[model samples]
Target: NLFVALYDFVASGDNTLSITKGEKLRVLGYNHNGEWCEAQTKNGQGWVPSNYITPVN
Candidate 1:
């Protein structure tokens, strides 16, 4: 069965994200001290270069 949960996301983890321009709020994950940042997409979830995303207020 295809199920999803908010916890599935890697909170406060190190990873990156790449993709999406205009669409729903596909929140990958919070940036942290690491080369990669967590990413969540229809394909799947995993890590990517942290440089890809930057945290800002």
Candidate 2:
């Protein structure tokens, strides 16, 4: 995945995230979604729009 912010975060594998309030995140999951993407950030794992990112499209 590509980070919209200067740098995004990856999952620590322990359900721990290392993201901030306004960090860019790219949906990188083993599985796939239609529009929403499952991504891992510095904060945690969540769903982000595949087209719409935090850093803006």
Candidate 3:
């Protein structure tokens, strides 16, 4: 189902964010501490190294 792709998003978490899913917010890269760098999101903007993020577009 299309929801599968919608639900299928690369996500990770840390001390700050417990979860950040959905392709709406793509992950940019990873930090030195293994955290992910996220791109501009509807929720907010900046590199959320703590809230694991998927690869950026």
Candidate 4:
């Protein structure tokens, strides 16, 4: 599914993805913890905090 970033996020770990507000993302899947999701951006693919994005309408 597609989502839009709600705020800027700096990746703190190798598995995480950095994103900027208003950036579009394609969500691959959610982790079992439900706080993070794997997503793809124009530059890379990695996990992002779920709360940082919203489903694109």
Candidate 5:
């Protein structure tokens, strides 16, 4: 699925992906807690904060 970032997120760890508001991301997976998700962008792929993104459609 695809999503759009709602706010800027600066990755706090090596496993996370940094994203800027308005960037589109391809969601690959999600953690059980639902707080984070695996996503890919033109830059690379890594985990991103789930709440920072919203479903594209």
Candidate 6:
């Protein structure tokens, strides 16, 4: 499945994903058993905060 970010996100770490508002992300699952989810974005594949995204479809 895929998700979309409601607001712009800047990576907080090397493993995180940076995206603009309304950017789409391929959901890859959680990271480190925590709140971040691994995701595939246009920029690259990295982790994004779960609370910041929502299902796209």
Q: Tell me, by TM-score, which candidate is best.
A: 4
Q: RMSD per prediction, one decimal?
A: 10.5, 6.8, 7.5, 0.8, 1.0, 1.3
In model 1, residue pairs whose N, Cα or C atoms come closer than 3 Å (at least 3 residues apart or on different chains), thus clashing, are 14-36, 15-36, 15-37, 15-38, 16-36, 16-37, 16-48, 35-50
lDDT, candidate 5, 2-53, per-residue tens: 8999999998987898999999999999999989999999988999989899
Q: How would you encode candidate 4's per-residue C-alpha lDDT over 1-57 as one tens digit per residue?
A: 899999999999869999999999999999999999899999799999999999997
What TM-score would each prediction reach against the true structure?
Answer: 0.35, 0.43, 0.32, 0.93, 0.91, 0.85
Lowest lDDT sum, 10 consecutive residues, model 5, at 9-18
Model 1 residue 30 CA deviation in Å: 6.1
Prediction 4 TM-score vs. true: 0.93
Model 2, runs deviating above 4 Å? 5-22, 30-33, 54-57
| Model 5 residue pairs with clashes | none
- The all-Cα superposition gives candidate 6 an RMSD in Å to the true structure of 1.3
| lDDT comparing candidate 2 with the true structure | 0.53
What's model 4's lDDT at 49? 95
Q: What is residue 51's positional error in candidate 3, in angstroms? A: 4.6
Model 3 per-residue lDDT tens digits across residues 2-52: 110123333344322223445355444446776545355554444554443
Worst 10 residues of 6 by lDDT: 28-37
Ranking by lDDT: 4, 5, 6, 2, 1, 3
Error of 5 at 8 (Å): 0.5
In angstroms, how far off is 28's CA in candidate 5? 0.5
Per-residue lDDT over 1-57 for candidate 6, one digit per residue giving the tens place of the 0 to 100 score: 888998888989878889788999898788676788899987898888888889988
Error of 3 at 50 (Å): 4.6
Whose lDDT is greatest here?
4
By descending TM-score, how would the candidates be arranged?
A: 4, 5, 6, 2, 1, 3
